[PDB]
């Protein structure tokens, strides 16, 4: 069933995951949008 899910595309192989993780760590580094900081602030202060 795992081979079937890998062939269907619902799962990827472990080596493909390894190379994808290396590629994403090497290439991408996101920033928070200015609209996304206010909700983070509100949720962080309500809990405290």
């Amino acid at each position: 069933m795992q081979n079937q899910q890998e062939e269907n595309g619902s799962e990827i192989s472990i080596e493909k995951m390894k190379r994808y993780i290396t590629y994403c760590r090497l290439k991408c580094a996101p920033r928070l949008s200015p609209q996304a900081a206010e909700k983070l602030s509100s949720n962080f202060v309500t809990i405290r």
Binding site: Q2, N3, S13, I14
Partner: protein
Amino acid sequence: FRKISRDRGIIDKIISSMAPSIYGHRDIKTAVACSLFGGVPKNVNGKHSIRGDINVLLLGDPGTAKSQILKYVEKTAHRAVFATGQGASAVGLTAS
């Protein structure tokens, strides 16, 4: 091997064959036979690995012939390596 395996009570005979010098410890002999024979170790899809060999713990009071059973397993098994914790004249358990 095939002629002796097709008997119905072969397994019992194997339990009777473990440590003839040891008397009355039938469950220990069964555990020793299971450890010597062992299961199959499997690795499904590469990602998940299941161990396939039986680890046995002989807990006992002094004078219950556990050491003699260990020497029998040493004599019987293809690759049996004996180690001890308190003793010194033996191969260690630590890679170095």
